[PDB]
Amino acid sequence: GAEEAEEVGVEHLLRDIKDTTVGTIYQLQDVFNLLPDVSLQEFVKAFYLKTNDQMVVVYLASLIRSVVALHNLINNKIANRDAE
Amino acid sequence: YYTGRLEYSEARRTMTNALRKAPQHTAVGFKQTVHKLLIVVELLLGEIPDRLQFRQPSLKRSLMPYFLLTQAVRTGNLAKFNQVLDQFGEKFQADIIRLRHNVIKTGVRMISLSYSRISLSKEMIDIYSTREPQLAFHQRISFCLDIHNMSVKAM
Amino acid sequence: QVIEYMIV
Amino acid sequence: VIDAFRLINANMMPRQTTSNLGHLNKPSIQALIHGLNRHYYSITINYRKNELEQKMLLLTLQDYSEHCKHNESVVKEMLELAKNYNKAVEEEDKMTPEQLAIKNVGKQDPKRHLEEHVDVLMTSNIVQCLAAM
Amino acid sequence: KSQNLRRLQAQRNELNAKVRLLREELQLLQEQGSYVGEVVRAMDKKKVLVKVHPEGKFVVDVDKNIDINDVTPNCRVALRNDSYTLHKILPNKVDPLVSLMMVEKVPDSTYEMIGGLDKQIKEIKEVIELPVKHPELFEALGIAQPKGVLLYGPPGTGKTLLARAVAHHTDCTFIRVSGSELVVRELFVMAREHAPSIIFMDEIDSISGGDSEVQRTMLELLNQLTKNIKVIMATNRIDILDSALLRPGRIDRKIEFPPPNEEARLDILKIHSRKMNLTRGINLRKIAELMPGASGAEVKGVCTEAGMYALRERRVHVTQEDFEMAVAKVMQ
Amino acid sequence: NPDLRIAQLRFLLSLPEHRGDAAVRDELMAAVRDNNMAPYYEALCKSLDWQIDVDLLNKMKKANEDELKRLDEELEDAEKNLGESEIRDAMMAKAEYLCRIGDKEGALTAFRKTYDKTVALGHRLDIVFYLLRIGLFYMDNDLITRNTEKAKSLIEEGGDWDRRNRLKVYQGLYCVAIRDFKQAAELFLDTVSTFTSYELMDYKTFVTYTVYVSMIALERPDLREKVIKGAEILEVLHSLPAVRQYLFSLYECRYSVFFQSLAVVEQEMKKDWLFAPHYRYYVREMRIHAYSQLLESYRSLTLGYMAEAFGVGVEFIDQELSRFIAAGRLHCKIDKVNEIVETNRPDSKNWQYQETIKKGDLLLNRVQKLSRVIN
Amino acid sequence: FLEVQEEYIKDEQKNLKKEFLHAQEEVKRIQSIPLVIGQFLEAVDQNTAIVGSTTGSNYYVRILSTIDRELLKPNASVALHKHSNALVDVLPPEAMLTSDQKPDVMYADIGGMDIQKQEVREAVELPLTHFELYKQIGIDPPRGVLMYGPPG
Amino acid sequence: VWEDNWDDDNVEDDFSNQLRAELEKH
Ligand SMILES: Nc1ncnc2c1ncn2[C@@H]1O[C@H](COP(=O)(O)OP(=O)(O)O)[C@@H](O)[C@H]1O
């Protein structure tokens, strides 16, 4: 559960150490029927591919936040530069 | 850069570290040979057309011989690379198999007529991929942004 | 790449 | 908001307290409330709990349509929102004063949107994908 | 290590100031809300004479850091939060005329796109920016003052647009008292405040004492009169108006607007045709071929109708014939 | 309207002994003998061309001081009964006259001078066309781009789309010079062209420039039909049969005349001042698009049928196509084991990857050029 | 000793982040039933404004920090605090009916009216559907439509 | 320009290679 509409009497009661820190034979026979996969021809290739595509996405991103972070750098450097 | 003055694994990262401090420094000696020498070594590893010739008009610092050897490998035959080498001969930086390596990257087709002609697991040929092949290049830019944090530690 | 996979 | 009180109906006639307890010289000091505080005189509310209770209170989705259609989506707003970020940095570079007319309350908001978009995917297009590995 | 440590002191003190004004922010918003209102300005020791929004009057004070000396009338800002005392100033909030200009938004910015009138703009620029931006040759030429221009012409063709354009090449102002819907003599004060101004009129007979009354009403105050205000009257006919205006010279200038001929109508149809896409070649003359009594409007109308007659076939280039069925349509 | 075909003459003279003197020499000095203009036409002949004789130059500078001297007293005359439209037009004596002086201060510091005291946008983009159009004559790319972002300020009522198309022709004529062959054709293609009796369009050139800028970047299936069955251009290349038989020799596969037709274009590459890697790259991509058009339909291409494309035989296709696959921009390979060329198609999924390695690197490098101490 | 309070600063930065992201949460009690709503008009500065309450007048305010300065259009209906009039949160456009499928006469049994039908068809629903063809020729969509009919 | 071209080595272009192509064939 979730404790709807009365978590005020839970979040007051979630002090020291906090939620995260806040601020930070038949069935087992059918278990291993769906385990084995090392067969990389097809599946392996597919897995390789998806990773590559998502990796790229991150590379694309990890770039525009670096740019806007650099914009915050020149904002702070021109700010303290004018405070000289 | 003086550490840049053998191995080729890190000559380009010391080329990035080298080509930084010269707004207007000298006209012989320090400012001159760092750029042209280091991009020559960047062809000693084998890096061809698309950073070479349009990046030239910034320096234009007497500009004959090293660019001539860059297109002498960009074409890649020993016949006119000879007259780049022997007819010039004073170009210095004395310290052949690489322009051989360029033309035989092609082949005729693959094998080349039952393993014999001259020019002068991912069943694809190496296009792209979604596994280990492209992952290496991917984690390049991620690393770059992480290394670019240093920006936040400067104010 | 689980070891390989700074952002925080 | 919890507070007990007294019988100071009458008896206007000790407790060093370390100087009157603190936070009842800071109530919501309102006249009908403080006029009620003449009779009221709240003191404290303590609290207990045990470790047990404390402790107690304390995948996938891959290409269904999911991974595609939340990186087919957000990169398009990175396209034209980065075009409006281009228009923002071109525009505010010159003739800018008074904190950009108070952060453009109007036409909110360029640039931050890009930061938010960047944040959304990098908590998603890695992490559970990471657990894919 | 101590220098880097004091950098960490700057970080910790910055975040601690954030939590300062967030904590006293959440206790802070339990206070009051200042009112707002226009005034008639002060006279005396502190003073205001405000008129607040719901009920319009009071006289209030002003805080030490307000410098009661600049706070001028009809520049709304207030703060008498509870006891009724000022704090600071706010956005001027557009004075009176800003209202009847943006409201009667009738006047449409115009500049030099007048469709083939050059004698007319030579004569109005002869008597509307020479008496404003070069008075020196009028006070040495013996001329007393030129003021008041009557624009008589057909409905269309020069009205509300010539008097607009040469009002704003000069950046003068353009007050229009055409109509008396929602609010004489008070307008003069606004014009005087503007220092230089131009007052414009209305022309209705067809597309007893309508606006010749106010016309003279402001020529009576204007004759003896803080000097660079120029009334402008547009009428369709010179004969229809009063004999009191027939008093040379009460109207120092009677500019005449003819209906446009061939080449002036290729000029105005050239400009309104310069509003949109056409094609590799029009040779606009054949449309002007039947211009015969036309009107300024009679040109903007047919150019928009030619655009719509290109729009009906989902086509993105206005061809030749959409003009021909535009001007061949509007003959009604 | 500075500067006309004198731009092309200024190219052709300074072009090497491909072309020198002799009757491009007189039409140049038809303007130089005309317009009486010292401050460029001595800097013109400075470039390995001509020296003193001063024979034209004296009354050239003398009429330069005549017109330049007489224009000043309208700037000093325009106060008697002459408003800012006449100080405006006195600065148009100084502006058109000191714009056909061909100086980059006499025009450039007069136009920002007349950008002050300025009536509405019968002016604000009249001069920023008239500044852009001489920036084409002096190829100062910063002046072009700053006149674009100064010229995207047409929000008048500026939805004047017989003046967007003037700017669209200016964008097409500039973007053909900065390798952006994508933006050039469509802009040109969907324009029609007309600019004050097409004087900068200088037609007998424009529709030709379209129909040999198209097949670089305008995609061979898509709007190439809009080129061919588009009834706006086909009738005006009817009088221009050379670029016509250059046009219908791709889609009709009559390639023994198409390389002939492209060798014509490599002789009228000489004219336009947007010149050298544009024609070398242009013949490169006409060439590569011509071969890639042929072998894409076949899973196997024989030596005799590829020799049938012109009649060149073997070694032209061999060395040339080996250079193209050395670039790796087609998918073929010189399979001399049988002398039959094979072609499958690995798609453009990899195109991106290869594209973006370089791209990504460059982008980060720019930031790597900035994000150090120098900021 | 300057290594001692070095361990202080890291713990204080961490714990001020703890109660800081915990401290953007105690401000959310001022937005609580019941708060008067009155529309936002002109922004003047940082965290204050001149919001227009529904109880008659507009009057000056101060707006809290947790709300972003994003949705505050000059007619944005925004809530105020009872007895205080401090701005708390912007709102969805609460107001009139959309008229879901209610009126029913066809455009085929209208009878006779053709030129007016293609003028209103031309200038109302066509620039809503084909909104960009007006931005491919040049003539703007006409803003209003005034219909004068006598006697109807 | 500013998109890196080759322009290196190659002898006179498709005009002359066209010329010795058709002449060498015929
Ligand atoms: N010479 C002209 N140049 C430009 N527009 C004109 C001209 N003559 C008439 N018009 C048109 O008339 C309209 C202005 O109305 P106006 O002429 O003031 O009405 P009236 O004719 O009653 O004075 C504008 O939309 C304009 O296009």
The Cα of F345 is separated from the nearest Cα of chain A by a number of Å equal to 19
Specify if E317 maps to a domain. yes
- Report residue B17: phi and psi, to 5°: -70, -25
Looking at chain D, which subunits does it touch, using at least 3 CB pairs closer than 8 Å as the criterion? A, C, G
Contact F99, F130 (CB under 8 A): yes
Order of strands, sheet of E175-176, starting from the edge strand that comes earlier in the sequence? E175-176, E197-200, E229-235, E149-152, E253-256
Residues E142 and E184 in one domain: yes
Q: Is chain H adjacent to chain G, meaning 3+ CB pairs within 8 angstroms?
A: no
Distance CA E133, CA E126 (A): 11
Who's near G105: CB < 8 A, 6+ residues apart?
A: none
Who's near B154: CB < 8 A, 6+ residues apart?
A: A73, A77
Q: Is E161 in the pocket of ligand 1 (CB under 6 A)?
A: yes
Who's near B88: CB < 8 A, 6+ residues apart?
A: B65
Q: Is E320 on the interface with F (CB under 8 A)?
A: no
Task: Give residue for tokens 């982008």.
Answer: F363
- Report residue F261: phi and psi, to 5°: -70, -30
- Report residue E266: phi and psi, to 5°: -75, -20
* Residue-range definition of the domain harbouring residue B74: 1-120
Distance CA F321, CA F330 (A): 9
Distance CA F300, CA F319 (A): 19
Distance CA F329, CA F325 (A): 6
DSSP state of G39: E
Distance CA E25, CA G27 (A): 8
Which among F47, F50, F43 is positioned nearest to F14, based on CA atoms? F47
Distance CA B81, CA G86 (A): 81
Which among E102, G27, B136, E129 is positioned nearest to F82, based on CA atoms? E129
Instruction: Scan residues 138-177 of F and list those with Cβ closer than 8 Å to H.
Output: 177
**Adjacent-strand bridge partners of E35:** none
Which residues in chain C have their C atom more than 2.5 Å from the N of the next written residue, marking a break after them?
5
Concatenated DSSP letters for E232-276? EEEES-SSSS-TTT-SSSSSSEEEE-PPP-HHHHHHHHHHHHTTS
CB count, 10 Å around CB of D96? 10
Which among D132, B42, B21, D7 is positioned nearest to A55, based on CA atoms? D132
Distance CA D68, CA E100 (A): 55
Which among E228, E221, E323, E240 is positioned nearest to E278, based on CA atoms? E323
Specify if E194 maps to a domain. yes
Radius of gyration from C-alpha coordinates of chain C: 7
Preceding omega of G151 cis (within 30 degrees of 0): yes
Residues B134 and B89 in one domain: no
Contact E273, F163 (CB under 8 A): no
| Domain count of the fold of chain B | 2
Distance CA F318, CA F311 (A): 13
Residues E138 and E224 in one domain: yes
**Adjacent-strand bridge partners of F300:** F342
Q: Is F277 on the interface with A (CB under 8 A)?
A: no
DSSP state of E64: G
Q: What is the CATH number of the domain that holds E299?
A: 1.10.8.60
Half-sphere exposure of E25 toward its Cβ, with a 13 Å CA cutoff?
A: 22
Looking at chain G, which subunits does it touch, using at least 3 CB pairs closer than 8 Å as the criterion? A, D, E, F
Q: Is A58 on the interface with F (CB under 8 A)?
A: no
Residues B4 and B47 in one domain: yes
What SS3 string covers chain D? Answer: CCCCCCCCCCCCCCCCCCCCCCCCCCCCCCHHHHHHHHHHCCCCCCCCCCHHHHHHHCCCCCCCCCCHHHCCCHHHHHHHHHHHHHHHHHHCCCCCCHHHHHHCCCCCCCCHHHHHHHHHHHCCCCHHHHHHC
Which among E153, E215, E205, E150 is positioned nearest to E180, based on CA atoms? E215
Residues B38 and B104 in one domain: yes
E93, E127, E161 — which closes off a domain? E93
Distance CA B33, CA F125 (A): 48
E242, E260, E278 — which closes off a domain? E260
Which among F111, F135, F136, F138 is positioned nearest to F125, based on CA atoms? F111
| Domain count of the fold of chain E | 3
Contact E234, E257 (CB under 8 A): no
The Cα of E332 is separated from the nearest Cα of chain G by a number of Å equal to 15
Half-sphere exposure of F310 toward its Cβ, with a 13 Å CA cutoff?
A: 27
Distance CA B78, CA B96 (A): 8
Distance CA F41, CA F55 (A): 13
Residues B150 and B106 in one domain: no
Who's near E328: CB < 8 A, 6+ residues apart?
A: none
E260, E275, E305 — which closes off a domain? E260
**Adjacent-strand bridge partners of F341:** F301
CA of residue E299 to ligand 1 center, whole Å: 9
Which experimental technique did the depositors report for determining this structure?
cryo-EM
CB count, 10 Å around CB of D109? 19
Distance CA B25, CA B30 (A): 8
CA of residue E127 to ligand 1 center, whole Å: 21
Torsion of CA E128, E130, E135, E136, to 10 degrees: -170
Task: Give residue for tokens 């080509």.
Answer: B19
Task: Give residue for tokens 């037609």.
Answer: F203
Which among G95, G89, G82, G96 is positioned nearest to G40, based on CA atoms? G89
Which among E177, E189, E199, E261 is positioned nearest to E226, based on CA atoms? E189
Contact G34, E29 (CB under 8 A): no
Residues E133 and E204 in one domain: yes
- Report residue E227: phi and psi, to 5°: -135, -20
* Residue-range definition of the domain harbouring residue E237: 94-260
Total residue count of chain E as it appears in this document: 332
Residues B61 and B112 in one domain: yes
User: Residue A54 has which token pair?
Assistant: 């998502």
CB count, 10 Å around CB of D32? 7
CB count, 10 Å around CB of A77? 14
Specify if E1 maps to a domain. no
User: Residue E67 has which token pair?
Assistant: 């410098």
DSSP state of E41: -
Residues E76 and E129 in one domain: no
Distance CA E19, CA E22 (A): 5
CA of residue E156 to ligand 1 center, whole Å: 5
Q: Is G149 exposed, middle or buried (0-12, 13-18, 19+ CB in 10 A)?
A: exposed
Q: Is D133 on the interface with C (CB under 8 A)?
A: yes
User: Residue E140 has which token pair?
Assistant: 């040495």
Which among F69, F136, F127, F117 is positioned nearest to F95, based on CA atoms? F127
Which among A60, B127, A49, B138 is positioned nearest to F348, based on CA atoms? B127
Residues E107 and E175 in one domain: yes
Contact G79, G91 (CB under 8 A): yes
Q: Is A43 on the interface with B (CB under 8 A)?
A: no
Contact G111, G123 (CB under 8 A): no
Residues E142 and E247 in one domain: yes
Contact residues, chain F, for H3 at CB < 8 Å? 179
Distance CA F191, CA F168 (A): 7
Q: How far apart are the first and last CA of chain D?
A: 49
Contact F186, F150 (CB under 8 A): no
Reading phi first (left if > 0) and then psi (alpha if -120 to 50, else beta), residue E55 is in beta
Q: Is chain B adjacent to chain H, meaning 3+ CB pairs within 8 angstroms?
A: yes
Residues B75 and B29 in one domain: yes
Burial E62-81 (b: 16+ CB within 10 A, else e): beeebebeebeeebbbbbbb
What SS3 string covers chain F? Answer: CCCCCHHHHHHHHHCCCCCCCCCCHHHHHHHHCCCCCHHHHHHHHHCCCCCCCCCCHHHHHHHHHHHHHHHHHHHCCCCCCCCHHHHHHHHHHHHHHCCCCCCCCCCHHHHCCCCCCCCCCCCCCHHHHHHHHHHHHHCCHHHHHHHHHCCCCCCCCCCCCCCHHHHHHHHHHHHCCCCCHHHHHHHHHCCCCCCCCCCCCCCCCHHHHHHCCHHHHCCCCCCHHHHHCCCCCCCCCCCCHHHHHHHCCCCCCCHHHHHHHHHHHCCCCCCCCCCHHHHHHHHHHHHHHHHHHHHCCCCEEEHHHHHCCCCCCCHHHHHHHHHHHHHCCCCCCCCCCCCEEECCCCCCHHHHHHHHHHHHHHHHHHHHHHCCCCC
Residues E198 and E321 in one domain: no
Residues B15 and B91 in one domain: yes
CA of residue E194 to ligand 1 center, whole Å: 27
